[PDB]
């Protein structure tokens, strides 16, 4: 029931965020066309003046400090511009602290559900291509000193051109611990680095080549027995070698995302789209 007067915001911040703000005359939220809802708020189809967007409606913010943190995150995220990173089209902050986050619409949804869908017919080349795109997006994010912390196929989106966008970060968080994607040292210390993102990226590559099986179909104990994820049936040997490098027990010895983009670009280039990938019978329906 808390009232908030947004004129209490620091004028310098309000001026600084103006380039991120979308006016009400520029946005139609299609309220009867819901993409998804839950504790995070709600996601609707939108039109931005026309361009098809997803509009996340957040829970009301009634503290000026929290509003200011939201606006600041908007300014920062606006400049995280890269072809393989989900962009922020803009924000709105209506009366009584009712926020909207406006994102590009992703025709093909998240990458995990996309590859799992039996009516889709990916090749090895396609799946490696998706992984390469994710590596490019992560190379960018790492260059901004940004650590994702939940890199996974479910947190990447796919647009109408089959371009992968690394998502679930910044103001695009909460649109729907991840121990099975975490590096050993993160399991042990709760600390995340770009090198622990590289570990997660190896698991994401495994998700791609299995067409979205759950990893390890108790994890610290299991890993410390001397174990890794098994080579997927359709995973090329050089790509499995890259996965093992991503899971190096020494964080400093893992490849950088720059090295990953280089290595995977080379592997990708050798394929011509001849090899169709199918699910492993022992992984189908496993949660």
From Swiss-Prot:
Binding site for ATP: 35-43, 56
Tissue expression per record: Expressed in normal hepatocytes as well as in epithelial cells lining the stomach, the small and the large intestine. Found also in basal keratinocytes of esophagus and skin. High levels are found in liver, gastrointestinal tract, thyroid and kidney. Also present in the brain. Expressed in metaphyseal bone (at protein level).
Effect upon mutating residue 240 to F: No effect on ligand-induced CBL-mediated ubiquitination
Region annotated Interaction with RANBP9, chain positions: 158-287
Domain of life: Eukaryota
Chain positions found as Phosphotyrosine: 176, 276, 283
Compartments where located: Membrane
Domain (Protein kinase) ranges: 29-272
Cytoplasmic side: 1-287
Domain remarks in the Swiss-Prot or TrEMBL record: The kinase domain is involved in SPSB1 binding. The beta-propeller Sema domain mediates binding to HGF.
Record function comment: Receptor tyrosine kinase that transduces signals from the extracellular matrix into the cytoplasm by binding to hepatocyte growth factor/HGF ligand. Regulates many physiological processes including proliferation, scattering, morphogenesis and survival. Ligand binding at the cell surface induces autophosphorylation of MET on its intracellular domain that provides docking sites for downstream signaling molecules. Following activation by ligand, interacts with the PI3-kinase subunit PIK3R1, PLCG1, SRC, GRB2, STAT3 or the adapter GAB1.
Quaternary structure annotation from Swiss-Prot or TrEMBL: Heterodimer made of an alpha chain (50 kDa) and a beta chain (145 kDa) which are disulfide linked. Binds PLXNB1. Interacts when phosphorylated with downstream effectors including STAT3, PIK3R1, SRC, PCLG1, GRB2 and GAB1. Interacts with SPSB1, SPSB2 and SPSB4. Interacts with INPP5D/SHIP1. When phosphorylated at Tyr-283, interacts with INPPL1/SHIP2. Interacts with RANBP9 and RANBP10, as well as SPSB1, SPSB2, SPSB3 and SPSB4. SPSB1 binding occurs in the presence and in the absence of HGF, however HGF treatment has a positive effect on this interaction. (Microbial infection) Interacts via extracytoplasmic residues 25-656 with L.monocytogenes InlB; MET can bind HGF, its endogenous ligand, and InlB simultaneously. InlB probably dimerizes upon binding to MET, which encourages subsequent dimerization of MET.
The family this protein is said to belong to: Belongs to the protein kinase superfamily. Tyr protein kinase family.
Protein name according to UniProt: Hepatocyte growth factor receptor
Gene: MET
